[PDB]
């Protein structure tokens, strides 16, 4: 049993792996009821006070000489990747409920000038007490969700997250990524050669969802909708 401030965990209770990182299940040393995820980063913020129902809370952190430990809110429902694998696709009404929650979380991050950069289904966690609550984490390996300007090592901004959300919502609607690639290098070459991109949207898609997806899935960030346009898009206020 190891401890970080008022929290404890065993390396036997592995939740997942990230970039040179591992995540263990742990708990409050006093309140064994309060479960946490402990992220151990190998070296090889505002986040602590940043607080939203759709953001995984940071309860504590601890830099050591070669290691960094984050004590995070425990989410019991797995990730969007698992949900999408089970359901294959989601209804527009479920997509809209998911997107309202992501948009709220992203608005707070945009407010504080924070850009996620690696939004993907494995970083969008579900919490069951739809009533499904989504929580964004890490504010791996799959490059399908990275904005073109990111995978081509350019000067990107907040708009990179809008590309990622576009690719996630497209996969929610259709069951597939909009620009599928055997490999990163292929995806990087596809975006290099294709200065224009039109994703194929099923004709049955509602006009507001089609309009939103075309506005997010713009190859060039100058043409991509900005955060305020996304947050207030008519799709997010349309009736079920
Ligand atoms: C980069 C994506 C990935 O597959 N790794 C990963 C693993 C585990 C978490 C995580 C974070 C916070 C949390 N709270 N309860 C459960 C978890 C899991 C995130 C990303």
Curated annotation (Swiss-Prot):
Keyword vocabulary terms for this entry: Acetylation, ATP-binding, Autophagy, Cytoplasm, Kinase, Nucleotide-binding, Phosphoprotein, Serine/threonine-protein kinase, Transferase, Ubl conjugation
Tissue: Ubiquitously expressed. Detected in the following adult tissues: skeletal muscle, heart, pancreas, brain, placenta, liver, kidney, and lung.
Quaternary state and interactors: Interacts with GABARAP and GABARAPL2. Interacts (via C-terminus) with ATG13. Part of a complex consisting of ATG13, ATG101, ULK1 and RB1CC1. Associates with the mammalian target of rapamycin complex 1 (mTORC1) through an interaction with RPTOR; the association depends on nutrient conditions and is reduced during starvation. Interacts with FEZ1; SCOC interferes with FEZ1-binding. Interacts with TBC1D14. Interacts (phosphorylated form) with TRIM5. Interacts with TRIM21 and IRF3, in the presence of TRIM21.
Protein name: Serine/threonine-protein kinase ULK1
Gene Ontology terms for molecular function: ATP binding; GTPase binding; identical protein binding; protein serine kinase activity; protein serine/threonine kinase activity; protein-containing complex binding; small GTPase binding
Localization per Swiss-Prot or TrEMBL: Cytoplasm, Cytosol; Preautophagosomal structure
UniProt record, GO biological process: autophagosome assembly; autophagy; axon extension; cellular response to nutrient levels; cellular response to stress; macroautophagy; mitophagy; negative regulation of cell population proliferation
Residues noted as binding ATP in the record, renumbered to the chain: 15-23, 39
Location of the Protein kinase domain: 9-236
PTM summary: Autophosphorylated. Phosphorylated under nutrient-rich conditions; dephosphorylated during starvation or following treatment with rapamycin. Under nutrient sufficiency, phosphorylated by MTOR/mTOR, disrupting the interaction with AMPK and preventing activation of ULK1. In response to nutrient limitation, phosphorylated and activated by AMPK, leading to activate autophagy.
GO CC annotation terms, alphabetical: Atg1/ULK1 kinase complex; autophagosome; autophagosome membrane; axon; cytoplasm; cytosol; endoplasmic reticulum membrane; mitochondrial outer membrane
Residue positions of the active site: 118
Function: Serine/threonine-protein kinase involved in autophagy in response to starvation. Acts upstream of phosphatidylinositol 3-kinase PIK3C3 to regulate the formation of autophagophores, the precursors of autophagosomes. Part of regulatory feedback loops in autophagy: acts both as a downstream effector and negative regulator of mammalian target of rapamycin complex 1 (mTORC1) via interaction with RPTOR. Activated via phosphorylation by AMPK and also acts as a regulator of AMPK by mediating phosphorylation of AMPK subunits PRKAA1, PRKAB2 and PRKAG1, leading to negatively regulate AMPK activity.
Family: Belongs to the protein kinase superfamily. Ser/Thr protein kinase family. APG1/unc-51/ULK1 subfamily.
Positions bearing N6-acetyllysine: 135
Residues of the full protein shown: 8 to 282 of 1050
Top-level taxonomic group: Eukaryota
């Amino acid at each position: 049993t190891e401890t970080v401030g008022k929290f404890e965990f065993s390396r036997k209770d592995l939740i997942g792996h990230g970039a040179f990182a591992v995540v263990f299940k742990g708990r409050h040393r006093e309140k064994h009821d309060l479960e946490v995820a402990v992220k151990c980063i190998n070296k090889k913020k505002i986040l602590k006070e940043l607080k939203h129902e759709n953001i995984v809370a940071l309860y504590d952190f601890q830099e050591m000489a070669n290691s960094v430990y984050l004590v995070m809110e425990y989410c019991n429902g797995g990730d969007l990747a698992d949900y999408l694998h089970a359901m294959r696709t989601l209804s527009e009404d479920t997509i809209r409920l998911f997107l309202q929650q992501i948009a709220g979380a992203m608005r707070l991050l945009h407010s504080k000038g924070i850009i996620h950069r690696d939004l993907k289904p494995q970083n969008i966690l579900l919490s069951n007490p739809n009533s499904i609550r989504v929580k964004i984490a890490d504010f791996c390996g799959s490059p399908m969700y990275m904005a073109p300007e990111v995978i081509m090592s350019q000067h990107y901004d907040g708009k990179a997250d809008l590309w990622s959300i576009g690719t996630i919502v497209y996969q929610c609607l259709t069951g597939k990524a909009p620009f599928q690639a055997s490999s990163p290098q292929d995806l990087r070459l596809f975006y290099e050669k294709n200065k224009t991109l039109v994703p194929t949207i099923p004709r049955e898609t509602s006009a507001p969802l089609r309009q939103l997806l075309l506005a997010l899935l713009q190859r060039n960030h100058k043409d991509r909708m900005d955060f305020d346009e996304f947050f207030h898009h008519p799709f997010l206020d349309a009736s079920p």
